[PDB]
Amino acid sequence: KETAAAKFERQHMDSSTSAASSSNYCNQMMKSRNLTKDRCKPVNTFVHESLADVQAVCSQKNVACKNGQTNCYQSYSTMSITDCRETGSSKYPNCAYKTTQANKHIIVACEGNPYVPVHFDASV
Template identity: 60%
Template sequence: MGLEKSLLLFSLLVLVLGWVQPSLGVESRETQTQKFQRQHMDEEGHFPSSPTYCNQMMKSRGMTSGSCKPMNTFVHESWETVQAICSQGQVTCKNGKSNCHKSSSTLHITDCRLKGSSKYPKCDYTTTDSQKHIIIACDVVHYDASV
């Protein structure tokens, strides 16, 4: 029953967010779910095979336009696997809200961190590949942490 309820709530969220159509910029035209997928999902097998993975991905996903996003995580699992986390262990988010859920198993992820000497427009990232649990917020899709 919990899984069905979570999936129903998630589907409702996607439907509701799909109706919101702000007017300016790529980020404002996409739903929260689309933004999450653009910024955090890389299930198509683009596993980091080189130290330039993060530089390429951050640029191609629009996270180096106007400024360098300091940190980002890509999840190398199916969208269905990530959605299922919403029915797994509930935890408190970093912002104190109680809508976060922690994956019950470790997932293949890549952390991209801006190098200290890097300055916009030449954003230069370190690429760290690992297996970790992830935490996501489920009422508004948001990547919260990896542990």
């Protein structure tokens, strides 16, 4: 039964590319990572850094989570990410996404032993 940490990796890690490959990046990735299985997940972010670098964020700048919990952390450096956002025209099961590359600080929630990312909270 997929752990929270594995789920974070599936939903949010893509070290294989350095930045939104193409205009159809999100279309392919949202599907291949099984984020369009039961619905069109409206919004999702992929991080293009090493797993080590992203895991390291859990020991970086402690900030409040959007839900009010205290276990969020913001990266000291900007990281290469891609946001995926469902287009107005998107209709399940043909989930359509706008692919946007950027370089931003990430905020993740971390839990467990080992203390690792289990939720992507925001980019800033």
